[model samples]
Target: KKSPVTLIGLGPMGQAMVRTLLGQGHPVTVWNRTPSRAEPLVVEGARLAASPTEAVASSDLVILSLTDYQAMYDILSTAESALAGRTIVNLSSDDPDVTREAAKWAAKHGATFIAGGVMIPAYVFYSGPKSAFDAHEPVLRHIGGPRFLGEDTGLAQLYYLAHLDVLLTTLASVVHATALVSAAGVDEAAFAPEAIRMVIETGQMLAETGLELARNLASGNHPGELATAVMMGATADHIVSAAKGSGVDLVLPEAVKSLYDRTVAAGHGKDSWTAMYEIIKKKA
Candidate 1:
């Protein structure tokens, strides 16, 4: 039998999941606050539900892909009476705490909740009641391969929010570097390959050295076999000067130099650049 699924929200992510589910022959019932937003899915053979009530009442599994967990409350509360005995897969973006609280909220309304953190284009991390995830695993696979993090409802949200730091920082560096190079008469088209190569190489270096770096920070001893903080401090100074001379934004490079300078001032000038992590860790 084709699994009956209810999808709420008509954003890009939601629409993508709807298309994938429909392609896999799942009977998808859809609803949106703005009825017109569900038109495309309806045309694709999705049953358009008149309200959240009709939607939840039609399916054992309801998937939510809204802006955040708050929107879940706004919509689902209207049909709260129908939530009991139904499973809700929330693929919305939110902090781990919000996801945790949402789990409690769903339980209060007698619904099973699965928190999902959708990363990349089609990868999802899920955490919820083990039975809930196990029961819906096949259906969830149509949207993405569901990796169950654990029964802790907040785990998926935590993993998703944590990785954004690395991704955002790397992109910020890329943007700042591209701006600096553009000031020197280099277009992004000409510089992108080299930038990508450097990023990949740096990742390889981190893979090789990350464990030792962590050990050093843990032990409060940072040996500089690769590059000393003193050496990097000088390099950062030059980059800051170059950025200023080229009329590029000085904020990022200056921030880099400030960290290097602070690490040196803290008397770890001869230590590895990873020593700076200790300073920030201590600050927090």
Candidate 2:
């Protein structure tokens, strides 16, 4: 028998989730604060609840895909009495600490909590033979992708939020690199695939390097290899030449180029670029 599921929230992603559950024959019950938002799903055979109360009372599992965890709290807290015996499969994004607190609060109110971190985009959940994607179900293990940070209620959110640096920094570098290439009369499409590959390769290397960086900072291992100044000099040459050829004002590249100079003037030019971590890591 298909597990009875209640989906709260009617955002695009939320609606997609509802469609998936209903399509899978799960007898989905849906509710949204805005009743009109549930209209389409109702036409497609979803049982629409005008209030949170009616929704939770009818389902064995409750799934929330809200703007964030706070919104989930708002609705769930209102209908929490109905949640007394069901499992909540929540995909609300927030800090790990907040998720842990939410877990505790759920248990206090007599609910089994499975806090989820949705790695796959909503559209991906539609492919059936492919859609085993329950973010927290151990039975659907591999479908959920990496299980590394999901065990702890808060760790999933913590991991994604903190790890965004890997994405942001990589994109920042590539955007600058692409702008330079485009200025020299290359279409971004021509350079983007190669540029993206370089970004991924560099990112993998950086993650590996981060371990060495952590150790070096702890041991205060400043040395000639990978010195910050050397990198700055090489980077500046590329940015300056590339900018001049592009005939574009190079303020952003110039700004980044200045950072290394500042570091060297601070008397740490010869220090391993990894050594910069010492400035950030708090000393005991």
Candidate 3:
């Protein structure tokens, strides 16, 4: 028996997702706000759902790829009639609070909720090995990175935000390092080998940071004297200045500055900047 899945919001990434499902021989029903965008999939043997409700009504799983939580709110709020007894797997980008709220709303209508973050890009889904991107990690090795944070929809989203913050900042740091080194007229390519090694080393540091973060949460002391906002502010400032002195662009440095400012204004200057948990836990 074929398992049926409904896909909402046929954006570029969403289309790619549906393709993956169809490739796996799942029965996929897809819908988009603009009917025209869904035509190609309809022609390729996908069922074109006339409405979001129509899609959710018949499927065991409904996948949402909307732009953000607001877009989701606009559609679902207006189509409240279609929500009962459904399971929503949301792939939209937003914070955990937003995800948690959605879960609550879904529960009011008797829906099961799970949140998703596409940590990897679209290309990886098709071209990479199944293990790398597999949605069912225990079953297959697909080419995408997927994690089910918890049954509570908000848990996944909250983790997604933290994951993005770490990934983007790490990328920014690496790019800045390359730019600074290139200013000396040394070939940037020459640093590529060492850069790979640095990344591997940093990965270990990240694993340790994970353990520390868990401990912080358990102990409930989000203080910064151990890893305070002010120290981070100083460190980010020094990095930006050092990067510029070495000839790298300052934009990445400036972005780090923005995070520091937010932390200080939130009166977290004395708290560990890792208290970013406080931000996500807001409204909890």
Query: In the order shown, what is each candidate's alpha-carbon RMSD?
Result: 2.7, 6.3, 7.7
Q: Which parts of model 1 have CA positions greater than 4 angstroms off?
A: 210-222, 265-267, 282-284
Local distance difference test scores for all models: 0.89, 0.68, 0.69
Whichever of 2 and 3 has more lDDT, that candidate is: 3
> Which ten residues in a row are the worst by lDDT in model 2?
122-131
Model 1 CA RMSD to the hidden true structure, in angstroms: 2.7
Q: TM-scores for all candidates?
A: 0.86, 0.67, 0.64
lDDT of 1 by residue, 49-74 (tens): 98999999999999999998989999
Model with the higher lDDT, candidate 1 or 2: 1
| Cα misplacement distance, residue 46 of candidate 1 (Å) | 1.4
lDDT score for candidate 3 against the true structure: 0.69
**In candidate 2, which residue pairs get closer than 3 Å at backbone N, Cα or C atoms, i.e. clash?**
96-154
Q: Write the per-residue lDDT of candidate 2 for residues 120-160, one digit (tens) a residue.
A: 53111111111223433432232234344435666656666
Sort the candidates on lDDT, descending order.
1, 3, 2
Candidate 1 displacement at residue 76 in angstroms: 2.0
